[PDB]
Design a protein around this ligand. Structure first.
Ligand code: 7V4
Ligand code: B7G
Ligand code: K
Length: 271
């Protein structure tokens, strides 16, 4: 009974996932391993290739629309910020496609997203990352980790920890059906500050976590300790976002010429 209902519940969350995110992990790994295709990502590894990419690749956000140019490291930061805001929009529609999320009063929906999207983002980021770099422009480019390490502090320092997380997270070998549940549990989190209806959010969270528990038994039958490992990963993500916010505060304080998107400004006010 319990296992039956939770199976259907998981499927609806998976559909919400497949319906709203621009790239699946299945698609990402196929590009990053070059398994299939006639097209390979253009590799961005230094200044010259970054420029060739802005001259050639199609970006969701127009280069001319980014805040005025300042310098290479900042430009990269602007592209990171564009993609973050675009992922916030996707996560908002994903959450909204979950009926128990949409049933919450809108103010609770905002609180969950405000305190949850960065955790979800850095979890999902692992899908487009390997040890050597990550996909950009809807899979049309691949920016190398080494290049990103070469940017000046503080922009190199805010990037590398996410790769450290992602490589360890990818070793658990989750698929998109696992991630849908996992991301749903990050967003529907009853611990978030200022929540109005905590018990309702806690109950939803618990339902998702039980659904995920049973999902991993069927989908990863030989993986021992995988469910508790993922609970630790959720705790790990909180710490990763604490550090990230700390670094963002330092960027606000010391990089005054660097523009921060207003939506992310609204996200950081309280952390
Ligand atoms: C996490 C995702 C959203 N992301 C950013 C990103 C990846 C890994 C580590 C850090 C990082 O962003 C730290 C800044 C955060 C911003 C503001 C905020 O905190 O909301 C990216 O997908 C991305 C996009 C474009 C590029 C790029 C383009 C040309 O050269 C490089 C590199 C990455
Ligand atoms: C699109 C979902 C993500 C939204 C993230 C930003 C949330 O910002 C918050 O919006 C509230 C008004 O609604 C204000 O009361 C808070 O002061 C502000 O911090
Ligand atoms: K990897």
């Amino acid at each position: 009974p319990q296992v039956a209902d939770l199976k259907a519940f998981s499927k609806h969350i998976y559909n919400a996932y497949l319906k709203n995110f621009n790239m699946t992990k299945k698609k990402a790994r196929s590009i990053l391993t070059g398994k299939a295709s006639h097209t390979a990502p253009f590799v961005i590894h230094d200044i010259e290739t970054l420029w060739q990419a802005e001259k050639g690749l199609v970006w969701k956000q127009l280069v001319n629309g980014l805040p005025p140019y300042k310098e290479i490291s900042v430009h990269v930061f602007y592209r990171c910020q564009c993609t973050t805001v675009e992922t916030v929009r996707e996560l908002t529609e994903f959450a909204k496609s979950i009926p128990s999320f949409s049933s919450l009063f809108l103010n609770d929906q905002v609180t969950l997203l405000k305190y949850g999207v960065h955790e979800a983002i850095f979890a999902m980021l692992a899908s487009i990352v390997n040890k050597d770099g990550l996909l950009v422009a809807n899979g049309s480019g691949f920016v190398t980790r080494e290049f990103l390490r070469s940017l000046r502090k503080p922009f190199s320092d805010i990037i590398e920890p996410k790769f450290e997380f992602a490589v360890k997270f990818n070793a658990l070998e989750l698929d998109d059906s696992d991630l849908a549940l996992f991301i749903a549990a990050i967003i529907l989190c009853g611990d978030r500050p200022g929540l109005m209806n905590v018990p309702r959010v806690e109950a939803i969270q618990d339902t998702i976590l039980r659904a995920l528990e049973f999902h991993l038994q069927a989908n990863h039958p030989d993986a021992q300790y995988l469910f508790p490992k993922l609970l630790q990963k959720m705790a790990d993500l909180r710490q990763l976002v604490t550090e990230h916010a700390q670094m963002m505060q330092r960027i606000k304080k010391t990089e005054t010429e660097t523009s921060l998107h207003p939506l992310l400004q609204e996200i950081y006010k309280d952390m």
